[PDB]
Amino acid sequence: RPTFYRQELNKTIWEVPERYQNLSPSVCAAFDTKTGHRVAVKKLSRPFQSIIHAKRTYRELRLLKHMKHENVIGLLDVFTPARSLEEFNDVYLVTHLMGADLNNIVKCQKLTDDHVQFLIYQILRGLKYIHSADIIHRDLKPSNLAVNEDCELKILDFGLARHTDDEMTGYVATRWYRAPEIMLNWMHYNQTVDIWSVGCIMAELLTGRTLFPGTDHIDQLKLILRLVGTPGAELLKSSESARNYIQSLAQMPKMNFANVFIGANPLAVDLLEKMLVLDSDKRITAAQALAHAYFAQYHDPEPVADPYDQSFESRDLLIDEWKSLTYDEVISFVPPP
Amino acid sequence: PSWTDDLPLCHLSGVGSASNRSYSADGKGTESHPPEDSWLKFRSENNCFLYGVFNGYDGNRVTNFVAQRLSAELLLGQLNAEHAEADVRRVLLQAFDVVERSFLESIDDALAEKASLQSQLPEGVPQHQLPPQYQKILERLKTLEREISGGAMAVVAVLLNNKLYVANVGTNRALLCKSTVDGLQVTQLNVDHTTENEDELFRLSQLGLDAGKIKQVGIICGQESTRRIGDYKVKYGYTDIDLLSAAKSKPIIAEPEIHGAQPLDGVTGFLVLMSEGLYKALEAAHGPGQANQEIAAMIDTEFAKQTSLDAVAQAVVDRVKRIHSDTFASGGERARFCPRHEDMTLLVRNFGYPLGEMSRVYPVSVPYSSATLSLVMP
Ligand SMILES: Nc1ncnc2c1ncn2[C@@H]1O[C@H](COP(=O)(O)OP(=O)(O)OP(O)(O)=S)[C@@H](O)[C@H]1O
Ligand SMILES: [Mg+2]
Ligand SMILES: [Mg+2]
Ligand code: NI
């Protein structure tokens, strides 16, 4: 156990063992002295305040341990200052640093299709791999997507990820990148949600502005449906008041994304269209999209991984039990060479 | 998850409320069950106004349920200002039937799981003598009872361009209060649905029961209302309960009674919506008689003293608690009637009545005269 030390930043104390030093910002940069290169340290915000926070925390550890793809972040080291199954009340995750975020990058930089063309192919590569492990991500935004100086990229943040099922948590994803299925049919979605946000991110990493910045969950359904048109009643029949609300709004025609985004890569239109529809069944998957026209510059078929175990994390457990299965998972870690 | 919560609030109304209370013997101290009342006061675009006050019992699930769902059934386009009166009656009937159908549908699965469990217990054996093998099944039956129970009474008002409509299911009340130079004229726009209501008596008779023994017993299954939203025990299990046993159709229905087209042009005053608990508690303190008249006049007073409609409504609710509390506490005649009161909700909608503080010589009976006494006894 490396002797720990304490430093204050943004009004909180960070108790970390040495190795890492010269902290500078929920996550800071540092230099691991055992290594010789800069690293990113993530302190979990509140690790066990509710039963759902402990089970959100337990999953973000157990999933990142699982994935090994050059496009999805995995863990180099995980540690805690606490001693035993008692002092335990903090965890830290530390990943090789990137020096940039997609959100900041687009807040001060025009961007080419050839930039884009590559970034997304990387995304769908990790996505196709994540879906081929039975895990949904649920939160895909520029804020939680990382890129290198070259423009290499990996997927961040598994605080919101889960082994898929028919019954799922209802309030989910950031608002502007929240699939209509999220609200128009409570708790009964799949992994097509992840792909809807990718299209949302696709045309943001172009134009530079948020595709659907609706204020409330109502304003959001209005914005989305004024570009894909209203549901012609084939998809409709959702639930009760959900119906009711849509009938209250006037007819908006669907539009082809040609007239939509001017001066586009018509290569991208066609992929934007095949991505951001409404019918969950009839729309692209990361695989069928990977092998697609747009990425012929880089497509080289992109392998799948094992499946994620469940057993424990599909039952009803207490805020204690959820935190112990977390600790039994921090105690057993093994680094990579 | 609510498709109706963006809706702007009404600027011409306010609400006062207080929860149930039971008075302690130890001296001071009270106890409460979770409050089962609710309300709404929206203004759509359309320029449609919708008000409601809701009295729940057997938990507050049904009360919340009718509150979300009836909004979604009424303010999402189905009402508009150019709607004839036939239009308004149809829409309100449609709205109320949707809410009652989907509530019953919402619990059919739970009711089916309940029966399958109940058959898995030894027939007739008091559950307390039952060994630990069954303890899991009992636990579940306690939990299912919690998600299927509950009922609600509702009083609802619709205002479209000076036309006032009222829809009622139960014993909550609606008072239109106009100002004349004589004074305040109070009239109840709806009728109470009890077994004292002559027309409910005819409706209950026409379902094959005994208007005579129904009037005599007066109550049914805890509540006085002869109409309620929800409550599976009376919408499904009425054939078991006796002197209610041999009915051809549901004795307690969820259908609203609609009272409609009150012209409000050139009217000055206010609209009252209040829950049963409010006026019952005053009738416990003062005797039955004139609770509508007395609560109206309380409201009259606070109009001149308070700064907003919410303070007006809440001051009247506060005065009625104290009157009830004092009455119990004083030990006299009527204290036996006030060991507790129920949830109190009061809603006040203004129609041009003024709010806010900024808004002689006596001749002798028989004259003197400079110049054997008796008095008449009665
Ligand atoms: N490995 C990394 N390399 C570079 N920047 C990173 C790295 N990890 C995190 N960041 C930065 O930290 C920001 C937020 O990281 P997240 O992983 O989303 O943490 P978080 O969202 O605060 O945690 P939660 O509670 O699970 S949502 C990103 O927008 C990046 O700017
Ligand atoms: Mg699986
Ligand atoms: Mg994040
Ligand atoms: Ni009540």
Author numbering:
A (entry chain H): 5 to 29, 37 to 248, 251 to 314, 317 to 352
B (entry chain A): 15 to 373, 384 to 395, 404 to 410
What does the study report here?
The MAPK p38α is a serine threonine protein kinase that is activated by stress. A number of groups have shown that, during myocardial ischemia, TAB1 binds to and induces autoactivation of p38α, which in turn phosphorylates TAB1. In other words, TAB1 is both an activator and a substrate of p38α. TAB1 is a scaffold protein, the N-terminal region (residues 1–370) is a pseudo phosphatase domain with no catalytic activity, and the C-terminal region is unstructured and contains a p38α and a TAK1 activating region.
Here, we investigated the role of p38α and TAB1 phosphorylation on the interaction by solving the X-ray structure of the complex between p38α and TAB1 (residues 1–438) in their phosphorylated forms. To this end, we produced phosphorylated p38α (pp38α) and phosphorylated TAB1 at Serine 423 (pS423TAB1), measured their binding affinity, solved the X-ray structure of the complexes, and compared these to our previously published data on nonphosphorylated p38α and a short TAB1 (residues 384–412) 29-mer peptide. The X-ray structures of pp38α and nonphosphorylated p38α with TAB1 showed that the 2 complexes used the same binding interface to interact with one another. Phosphorylation did not affect the binding interface between p38α and TAB1; it instead induced major conformational changes of the activation loop of p38α, which contains the phosphorylation sites Thr180 and Tyr182. In pp38α-TAB1 complex, upon phosphorylation, the now-activated loop of the kinase swung away from the ATP binding site, freeing access to the catalytic site for other substrates. In pp38α, residue pThr180 sat at the interface between the 2 domains of the kinase with the Thr180 phosphate group interacting with Arg67, Arg70, and Lys66 from the N-lobe and Arg149 and Arg173 from the C-lobe, whereas the phosphate from pTyr182 interacted with Arg186 and Arg189 on the C-lobe. This loop arrangement is typical of active kinases. The crystallographic and biophysical data both suggest that TAB1 remains bound to p38α after having induced the kinase autoactivation and having been phosphorylated by it; they also show that no other region, beyond residues 384–412 in TAB1, was involved in the interaction with p38α. The structural data suggest that TAB1 does not dissociate from p38α after inducing autoactivation and becoming phosphorylated. The main structural finding is that phosphorylation does not perturb the surface nor the strength of their interaction, suggesting that pTAB1 remains bound to active p38α.
